[PDB]
Amino acid sequence: VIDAFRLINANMMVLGHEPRQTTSNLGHLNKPSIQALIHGLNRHYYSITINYRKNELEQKMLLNLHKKSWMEGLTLQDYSEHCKHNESVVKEMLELAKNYNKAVEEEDKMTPEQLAIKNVGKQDPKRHLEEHVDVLMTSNIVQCLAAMLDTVVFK
Amino acid sequence: FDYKEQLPESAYMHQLLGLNLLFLLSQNRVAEFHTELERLPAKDIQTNVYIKHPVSLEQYLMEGSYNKVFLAKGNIPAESYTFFIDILLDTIRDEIAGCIEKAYEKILFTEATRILFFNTPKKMTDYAKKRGWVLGPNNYYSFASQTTIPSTELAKQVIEYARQLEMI
Numbered sequence: 192v193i194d195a196f197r198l199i200n201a202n203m204m205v206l207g208h209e210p211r212q213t214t215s216n217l218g219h220l221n222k223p224s225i226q227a228l229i230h231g232l233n234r235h236y237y238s239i240t241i242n243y244r245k246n247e248l249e250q251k252m253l254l255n256l257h258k259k260s261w262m263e264g265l266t267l268q269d270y271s272e273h274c275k276h277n278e279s280v281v282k283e284m285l286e287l288a289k290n291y292n293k294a295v296e297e298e299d300k301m302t303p304e305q306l307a308i309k310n311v312g313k314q315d316p317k318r319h320l321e322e323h324v325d326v327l328m329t330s331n332i333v334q335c336l337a338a339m340l341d342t343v344v345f346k
Numbered sequence: 347f348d349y350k351e352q353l354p355e356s357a358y359m360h361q362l363l364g365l366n367l368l369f370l371l372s373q374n375r376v377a378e379f380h381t382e383l384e385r386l387p388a389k390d391i392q393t394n395v396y397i398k399h400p401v402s403l404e405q406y407l408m409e410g411s412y413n414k415v416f417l418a419k420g421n422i423p424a425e426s427y428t429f430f431i432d433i434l435l436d437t438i439r440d441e442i443a444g445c446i447e448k449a450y451e452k453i454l455f456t457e458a459t460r461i462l463f464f465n466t467p468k469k470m471t472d473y474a475k476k477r478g479w480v481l482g483p484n485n486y487y488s489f490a491s492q493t494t495i496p497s498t499e500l501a502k503q504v505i506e507y508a509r510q511l512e513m514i
């Protein structure tokens with residue numbers, strides 16, 4: 192959120208003039224905000240459109256941000272921690288499977304409030320089960336591939 | 347098989363069909379053997395000797411009953427079956443030798459002769475030279491010559507899992 196400004200002249204705005212010349216159709220910035228309009232936009236000052244310069248060279252370093260070293264790329268997660276994580280996540284998956292069986296049962300049974308007011312404040316077994324399967328499957332596939340690549344490259 | 351009716355069938359038909367089955371067995375085209383065998387009527391397959399001997403011989407070969415396969419050489423319901431049966435016996439000698447290779451951590455000679463169905467030590471020695479054996483230093487053919495993670499293939503499979511998950 193950033194905006195450029197220059198001030199309108201009291202002299203002109205009292206002596207009936209628009210202190211901007213509309214040669215182009217570039218006056219469609221964002222439909223100026225109500226905050227600016229009530230705080231004095233279009234009366235005492237005007238907004239100037241803002242753009243940015245792209246060099247494709249600074250962008251390379253900005254992309255290098257978030258980058259991980261090949262150490263992290265090839266590292267294997269602690270196998271004991273991985274096994275404990277799988278055990279735990281499968282336990283929550285078991286409980287969510289019980290709750291999913293319960294929910295699917297009493298889902299078609301009645302849908303007056305099932306649309307929006309049957310999950311607020313209550314856990315969604317289907318959603319949490321999807322989250323658990325996604326996370327655990329990602330972890331396991333990634334670690335398997337890492338282990339195999341390591342077994343070969345570091346031979 | 348084509349001209350059913352308008353023809354009275356030939357008594358030699360079943361004999362010659364059995365001979366064809368013997369030929370197919372000798373050349374080791376088992377699929378075609380079974381396909382043609384299915385053409386023979388049920389009771390013809392079950393009772394007629396000419397169609398029973400070929401099917402029974404295949405049954406024995408599949409089971410491994412090489413003794414009864416050899417005794418088929420004496421059975422020979424029609425003498426013309428000898429030609430297609432001799433080559434089958436030689437191939438079966440090879441198959442029996444393969445069985446001996448894989449099994450029999452150690453085997454002797456005097457009994458290996460009967461096992462391979464040979465009748466002469468000179469034939470035994472020639473056949474051992476074929477392929478290659480240790481000749482029985484203590485009269486025992488000791489052909490007892492009995493890791494590596496498929497990491498590449500497993501990585502390919504796991505990448506396939508990832509791609510099938512992420513093309514969602």
